[PDB]
Design an enzyme around this catalytic site. Structure first.
Site, PDB file in Angstrom:
ATOM      1  N   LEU A   9       0.824  -1.231   0.000  1.00  0.00           N
ATOM      2  CA  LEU A   9       0.000   0.000   0.000  1.00  0.00           C
ATOM      3  C   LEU A   9       0.857   1.280   0.000  1.00  0.00           C
ATOM      4  O   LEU A   9       0.416   2.279  -0.564  1.00  0.00           O
ATOM      5  CB  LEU A   9      -0.943  -0.027   1.209  1.00  0.00           C
ATOM      6  CG  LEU A   9      -1.993  -1.141   1.211  1.00  0.00           C
ATOM      7  CD1 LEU A   9      -2.721  -1.206   2.547  1.00  0.00           C
ATOM      8  CD2 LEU A   9      -2.996  -0.961   0.082  1.00  0.00           C
ATOM      9  N   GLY A  10       2.050   1.292   0.604  1.00  0.00           N
ATOM     10  CA  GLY A  10       2.902   2.490   0.540  1.00  0.00           C
ATOM     11  C   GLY A  10       4.076   2.426   1.497  1.00  0.00           C
ATOM     12  O   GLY A  10       4.901   3.333   1.503  1.00  0.00           O
ATOM     13  N   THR A  12       6.771   1.125   6.035  1.00  0.00           N
ATOM     14  CA  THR A  12       6.200   0.391   4.876  1.00  0.00           C
ATOM     15  C   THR A  12       4.853  -0.249   5.231  1.00  0.00           C
ATOM     16  O   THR A  12       4.734  -0.862   6.294  1.00  0.00           O
ATOM     17  CB  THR A  12       7.109  -0.768   4.460  1.00  0.00           C
ATOM     18  OG1 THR A  12       8.429  -0.241   4.333  1.00  0.00           O
ATOM     19  CG2 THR A  12       6.663  -1.440   3.180  1.00  0.00           C
ATOM     20  N   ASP A 109      -0.601  15.790  14.191  1.00  0.00           N
ATOM     21  CA  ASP A 109      -0.333  15.547  12.755  1.00  0.00           C
ATOM     22  C   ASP A 109      -1.629  15.396  11.962  1.00  0.00           C
ATOM     23  O   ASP A 109      -1.744  14.507  11.139  1.00  0.00           O
ATOM     24  CB  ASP A 109       0.523  14.292  12.597  1.00  0.00           C
ATOM     25  CG  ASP A 109       1.357  14.285  11.288  1.00  0.00           C
ATOM     26  OD1 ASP A 109       1.566  15.397  10.717  1.00  0.00           O
ATOM     27  OD2 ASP A 109       1.795  13.167  10.848  1.00  0.00           O
TER      28      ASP A 109
HETATM   29  N1  LIG Z   1      -5.032   1.417   8.128  1.00  0.00           N
HETATM   30  C1  LIG Z   1      -4.769   1.452   6.808  1.00  0.00           C
HETATM   31  N2  LIG Z   1      -5.511   0.783   5.894  1.00  0.00           N
HETATM   32  C2  LIG Z   1      -5.238   0.822   4.575  1.00  0.00           C
HETATM   33  N3  LIG Z   1      -4.219   1.523   4.054  1.00  0.00           N
HETATM   34  C3  LIG Z   1      -3.410   2.230   4.869  1.00  0.00           C
HETATM   35  C4  LIG Z   1      -3.634   2.242   6.320  1.00  0.00           C
HETATM   36  N4  LIG Z   1      -2.685   3.021   6.872  1.00  0.00           N
HETATM   37  C5  LIG Z   1      -1.910   3.474   5.840  1.00  0.00           C
HETATM   38  N5  LIG Z   1      -2.356   2.993   4.654  1.00  0.00           N
HETATM   39  C6  LIG Z   1      -1.808   3.237   3.294  1.00  0.00           C
HETATM   40  O1  LIG Z   1      -0.385   3.098   3.274  1.00  0.00           O
HETATM   41  C7  LIG Z   1       0.203   4.348   2.911  1.00  0.00           C
HETATM   42  C8  LIG Z   1       1.428   4.576   3.776  1.00  0.00           C
HETATM   43  O2  LIG Z   1       1.593   5.972   3.982  1.00  0.00           O
HETATM   44  P1  LIG Z   1       2.162   6.513   5.379  1.00  0.00           P
HETATM   45  O3  LIG Z   1       3.652   6.269   5.379  1.00  0.00           O
HETATM   46  O4  LIG Z   1       1.295   5.941   6.478  1.00  0.00           O
HETATM   47  O5  LIG Z   1       1.868   8.102   5.293  1.00  0.00           O
HETATM   48  P2  LIG Z   1       3.029   9.220   5.397  1.00  0.00           P
HETATM   49  O6  LIG Z   1       2.395  10.456   6.004  1.00  0.00           O
HETATM   50  O7  LIG Z   1       3.660   9.348   4.028  1.00  0.00           O
HETATM   51  N6  LIG Z   1       4.239   8.598   6.507  1.00  0.00           N
HETATM   52  P3  LIG Z   1       3.804   8.027   8.110  1.00  0.00           P
HETATM   53  O8  LIG Z   1       4.583   8.902   9.063  1.00  0.00           O
HETATM   54  O9  LIG Z   1       4.249   6.582   8.150  1.00  0.00           O
HETATM   55  O10 LIG Z   1       2.304   8.199   8.182  1.00  0.00           O
HETATM   56  C9  LIG Z   1      -0.877   5.412   3.095  1.00  0.00           C
HETATM   57  O11 LIG Z   1      -0.753   6.504   2.178  1.00  0.00           O
HETATM   58  C10 LIG Z   1      -2.160   4.650   2.877  1.00  0.00           C
HETATM   59  O12 LIG Z   1      -2.551   4.655   1.502  1.00  0.00           O
END
Ligand SMILES: Nc1ncnc2c1ncn2[C@@H]1O[C@H](COP(=O)(O)OP(=O)(O)NP(=O)(O)O)[C@@H](O)[C@H]1O
Ligand SMILES: [Mg+2]
EC number: 2.7.11.22
Length: 283
Positions: A9-10, A12, A109
């Site tokens: 998903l992104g 990690t 945040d």
């Molecule tokens: N609970 C969840 N369910 C589904 N997808 C998710 C969930 N949490 C995060 N994601 C996905 O995974 C990606 C990871 O991004 P993320 O790293 O969480 O955001 P960021 O602000 O770039 N860094 P972080 O500090 O980790 O939040 C997100 O953009 C979502 O699309």
């Protein structure tokens, strides 16, 4: 351990399948995480992301799977947000946040991509990486501030003492972004962020913000008149303008709280909040 890695998903993030219930979840893999597990494990509110499990070999946090987030909705031109849509998202945001603040937790945040949405239109605050008990000390050189566009003026002027106001300012920026479908105050630098705040909302007078001149990084900007809120949000009713106004008050002690926001007439007035299942979803 007991989860099979489905889709990426992104840190990690993976989709996964709990082999107990066969429930679908999101697994986040990497001391930022210690403080996160502490708060999140014991919290329980419909509009706060649930931490279902954690395990360490790095740390993996297992969260409710959420199919989308507010930033995706905001950026999706195929979706039109109605007044009822906006009211539903704000109500869920504020009820989550009210919970946190009653438990003496600052999110720190809040921005659209940290408001996650499930397939039934339940919005949930997520990413407690910067979240803080009200009375925890704020570090000298490792101080964690929201992304600049959602950042309250007291933080941009280097406040080390702050509270609920930092979240409520961010909530105003999220509201403004729902209405405008673009970021409200897109500063290209920390100084430009203040510039944009002041040329949009006015350079604060000392009666609007008594203690401003004694903030650690206070400096003198030009006097900007600001722009009438009804000119900026030309589609918003007086009740919505009053809420927006309350969220963007310069004095962090006068700025509206989550509880005061939820009691405003905006939330009891027609039109009502969209039922979650009718909230617009990326197709
Ligand atoms: N609970 C969840 N369910 C589904 N997808 C998710 C969930 N949490 C995060 N994601 C996905 O995974 C990606 C990871 O991004 P993320 O790293 O969480 O955001 P960021 O602000 O770039 N860094 P972080 O500090 O980790 O939040 C997100 O953009 C979502 O699309
Ligand atoms: Mg995030």
């Amino acid at each position: 351990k007991r989860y099979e890695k489905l889709d990426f998903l992104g840190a990690t993030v993976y989709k996964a399948r709990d082999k107990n219930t066969n429930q679908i979840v999101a697994i986040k893999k990497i001391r930022t995480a210690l403080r996160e597990i502490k708060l999140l494990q014991e919290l329980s509110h419909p509009n706060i992301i649930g931490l279902l499990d954690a395990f360490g070999s790095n740390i993996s946090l297992v969260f409710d799977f959420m199919e989308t987030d507010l930033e995706v909705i905001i950026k999706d031109n195929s979706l039109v947000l109605t007044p009822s849509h906006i009211k539903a998202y704000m109500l869920m945001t504020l009820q989550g946040l009210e919970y946190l603040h009653q438990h003496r937790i600052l999110h720190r945040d809040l921005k659209p991509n940290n408001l996650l949405l499930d397939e039934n239109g339940v919005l949930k605050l997520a990413d407690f990486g910067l979240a803080k008990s009200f009375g925890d000390p704020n570090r000298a050189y490792e101080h964690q501030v929201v992304t600049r566009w959602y950042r309250a003026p007291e933080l941009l002027f280097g406040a080390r003492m702050y509270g609920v106001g930092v979240d409520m300012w961010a909530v105003g920026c999220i509201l403004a972004e729902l209405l405008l479908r673009v970021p409200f105050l897109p500063g290209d630098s920390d100084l430009d962020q203040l510039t944009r705040i002041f040329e949009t909302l006015g350079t604060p007078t000392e009666e609007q913000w008594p203690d401003m001149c004694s903030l650690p990084d206070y400096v003198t900007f030009k006097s900007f008149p600001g722009i009438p809120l009804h000119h900026i949000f030309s589609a918003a009713g007086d009740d919505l303008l009053d809420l927006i106004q309350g969220l963007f008050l310069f004095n962090p002690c006068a700025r509206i709280t989550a509880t005061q926001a939820l009691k405003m007439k905006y939330f009891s007035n027609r039109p009502g909040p969209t039922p979650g299942c009718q909230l617009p979803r990326p197709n």
